Design a protein around this ligand. Sequence first.
Ligand SMILES: Nc1ncnc2c1ncn2[C@@H]1O[C@H](COP(=O)(O)OP(=O)(O)OP(=O)(O)O)[C@@H](O)[C@H]1O
Ligand SMILES: Nc1ncnc2c1ncn2[C@@H]1O[C@H](COP(=O)(O)OP(=O)(O)OP(=O)(O)O)[C@@H](O)[C@H]1O
Ligand SMILES: [Mg+2]
Ligand SMILES: [Mg+2]
Ligand SMILES: [Zn+2]
Lengths: 618, 396
Amino acid sequence: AVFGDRVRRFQEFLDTFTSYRDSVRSIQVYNSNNNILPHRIIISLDDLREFDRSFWSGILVEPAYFIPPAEKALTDLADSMDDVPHPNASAVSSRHPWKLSFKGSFGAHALSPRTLTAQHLNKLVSVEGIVTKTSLVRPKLIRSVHYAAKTGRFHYRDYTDATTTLTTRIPTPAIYPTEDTEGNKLTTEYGYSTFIDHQRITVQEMPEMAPAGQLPRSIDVILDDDLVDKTKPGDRVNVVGVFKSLGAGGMNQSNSNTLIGFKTLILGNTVYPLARQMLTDFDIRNINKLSKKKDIFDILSQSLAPSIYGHDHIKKAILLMLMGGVEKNLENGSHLRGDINILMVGDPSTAKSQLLRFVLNTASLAIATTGRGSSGVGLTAAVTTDRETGERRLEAGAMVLADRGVVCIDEFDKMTDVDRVAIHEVMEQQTVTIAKAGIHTTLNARCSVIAAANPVFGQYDVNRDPHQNIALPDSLLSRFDLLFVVTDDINEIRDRSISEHVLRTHRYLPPGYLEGEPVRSLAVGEPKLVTIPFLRKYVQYAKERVIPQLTQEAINVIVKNYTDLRNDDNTKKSPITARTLETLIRLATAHAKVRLSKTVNKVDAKVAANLLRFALLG
Amino acid sequence: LPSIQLPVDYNNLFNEITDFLVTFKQKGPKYMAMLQKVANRELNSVIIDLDDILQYQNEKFLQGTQADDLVSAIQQNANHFTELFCRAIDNNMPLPTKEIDYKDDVLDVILNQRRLRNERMLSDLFPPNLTRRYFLYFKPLSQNCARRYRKKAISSKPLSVRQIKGDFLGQLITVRGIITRVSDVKPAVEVIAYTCDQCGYEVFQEVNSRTFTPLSECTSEECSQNQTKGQLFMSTRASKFSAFQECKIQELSQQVPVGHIPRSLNIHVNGTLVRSLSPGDIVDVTGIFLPAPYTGFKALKAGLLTETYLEAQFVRQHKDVYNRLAKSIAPEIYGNLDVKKALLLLLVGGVDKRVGDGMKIRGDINVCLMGDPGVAKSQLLKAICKISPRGVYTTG
DNA sequence: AGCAGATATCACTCAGCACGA
DNA sequence: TCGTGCTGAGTGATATCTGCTTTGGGTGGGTGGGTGGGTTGAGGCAAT
Ligand SMILES: Nc1ncnc2c1ncn2[C@@H]1O[C@H](COP(=O)(O)OP(=O)(O)OP(=O)(O)O)[C@@H](O)[C@H]1O
Ligand SMILES: Nc1ncnc2c1ncn2[C@@H]1O[C@H](COP(=O)(O)OP(=O)(O)OP(=O)(O)O)[C@@H](O)[C@H]1O
Ligand SMILES: [Mg+2]
Ligand SMILES: [Mg+2]
Ligand SMILES: [Zn+2]
């Protein structure tokens, strides 16, 4: 009775707003023309609230009774809209109803894994956090279709589960019917049965937002059908779903615990990424106009870490690393990486850690690790078991997680050789090889490595040769494209400048804050320095839509520079090698990418040579 | 058990299959000749080419007697069509042309004696799979043939393990990947034969599951009538077995997305396809994606979550002399003639090691390269290892 | 679903007597 | 002392219903055991 009234009311709501009808028509037209779009519609809670307050409130506080009616109304509207002449047997037998999706503003239901409490059960909530785990995808049985040869008719059965439907129903064992009502033998029609994908993920509270002295908490989320593979570990997501409770929770006499609560999880409706900034026509035009400037490189380099005084060359190297070179794989099998690795060895208090933090924040994908805080296994991959399935699998490590990204390693010299070996393999081959518990696989690890280290004595000594100063293996050192040695030199002018800069920085106050006040979302769906968001947009554009190709003049410059540097009496902080030629080519390609140029020109070669010369001979 | 009205009529499809088997030509009919060969014990596996079915459908449409789309029906649900084709073949099996020793086979004698006993009883029966001496497989629809007739070939389109979802269950699909594990060949039971100690009759049982419950009590007419309680005892001599092999196929490196771990899919091999897959070979396995329901308490405890595997149906396997050889060892590197010649000498490794006095001079010309970083040591290693047939690359 | 213990309702054996032989 | 029922309650027996529990995995525990399985990773300790 009430169910039909709610269905009719949601039908009226959908009729009033023609945008959803147009979206459904477009999806159906695209599917008919042809890879396929899932039967899902995103509706705005604000429009529903403006239309009917009662329905919006019910959906927010009592989704179990108000969502299925809306889904049925949407399915009926789509079916009435459908005009397919011949429905395929699988289509007729398919159980594919339209699923509703929500956006807008969740006033008090916008929470985090820490703030989810028993008072929010059976309510629509929005959870924001970081994905830490991801179960394997497996199909789930909802409908079974059978055939009786003698009768010549198809019989079907429908299955339900605690997680498949919002409303509780009698449990249904997965035992396939074998016999008809009259005793007729039945044959299972797998091709006509309906299965849907199922996956379980764990969303973790963001560590920065956790209380003082308390470890982050996490909540389990269930994804079905088209939301199965929308996330990977390490992603920041905004999940919308219905907080639910499952099981007896010790109520049953079989559990003697009498002190154990119920199980709880979320049945996800949406997954909203929190990584790629959409580029507008105005943004693209601004990027092009800024790139056309002759000194674009200087401005972009200066815009990185405005609070760090000096270190211009290190900033240029970081920018080139962010832009990255062009990766070429030859037919014979040789693989040439386009990533640029950077190492900084210097005296204490030289802004190495701050630079690492800044590159961690700015880079689209970045993972931070420490020397003493990491392990070989924690870097590569760990063997573990899947709760959902109970299947032996692999868990991505630091290196793996940062594929096509950047990994920042702090205190690089405070590590162990055991741990070092993993890294050595990673940088050398850009792949991870695992041989454990009957697992034989190769993991792609294509990440740029930026690390900071200290001398063995804790202070760089000019008298002693570079080999004695740094204890890291020579083989590991050779993989780094650029090595920067930074020392703290006492000079009156530089000391005064640095002190004034630090004092000016320490006097900053945030907007909307009174003096002496200590430093403490609305919607879900939603020579001048360059602002950081614009820098991110520029980096994304350049790294996505530019692949510079080499030219003859750049080659002449590169070979001239290599010949001059390798056979020169002047000593170098790092030995010259054929890898230096590849480093020069990579830096030239990165500089070409900076200017949004399809070809590498003499300017790029000159800039790369200057940077390499500064890094080598200071 | 509510019913549905689906637009499929299995009787018409069976008639289509019989007509295709009897009449299709591409001399006499190809499949009639194949069945004649099978009858004479010359062939133990029959492969149905979907291209032939498509051509037959096109010819029928051209002649004006338009018939049902058999290719699409087979692709959408292949498990039923295996049995349908087996029945069609059985109903039209030609009489043998080469005399054979029938009395040698145990099954022939047992069935003949069952017939004699039945005749005696009347004067006062066995599963079709038991006597089948062939295996049926489906060859996917070739892309060239599909494009010739303006059709899309879902079955032959390669897919990764990730792209195989739950909506593909029960269909004929192809998987591209690298085999990582192959198990030993073991006998899988299909029909079980029992015997009665008292009756003297033979009973049969069909197995279509992971597990089965053996019979304990006789069910024969004689036993029932006479009230004699006779125990059933398993007989492996008259039972029917099929070779079984379980293989694992893993994703290729280029198929995994960014920041993702490769996944694997199980493969089940039955019949004559056994030993067609070995570890390390990249293959295009075509099969029927099917679920593997649990049994007993496990079934109840598991829930709706189902395992899956692939029933293998077709497997496609992917693919001055001294100076010249030395230079061609590793063209990409700068000329190092002496090192290349040493590598050639190591690779050939010619030697006469036949002392026979208790030991024999080592027959390997071992080579060691030592140098400062910068030389292409890794490149020589990789190239010389690739060329060698038994070359193995390892890292200390 | 299968298995082990148990209840209760199903027949069958020795028991013995009346008639007559 | 044979044959043919009629009586009969005793001594069965076998055709017939009433309650576990299991797989393996912490949605049974550590007053069921670690020689019935799980089991790779981190951590602290002593001999080295
Ligand atoms: N050039 C600089 N401009 C401004 N602040 C600086 C600069 N160099 C260092 N600092 C200050 O140094 C403080 C701490 O130094 P930081 O942690 O960056 O050192 P580090 O290079 O990681 O050295 P180490 O790890 O060897 O101690 C930071 O708070 C930053 O304010
Ligand atoms: N003769 C050469 N011609 C061209 N490139 C070369 C040559 N020698 C070395 N290289 C380059 O040197 C780069 C690094 O050296 P490579 O890994 O080949 O050997 P290696 O220096 O002996 O190694 P390792 O650093 O592991 O001891 C390779 O990318 C290769 O391209
Ligand atoms: Mg530091
Ligand atoms: Mg090497
Ligand atoms: Zn019997």
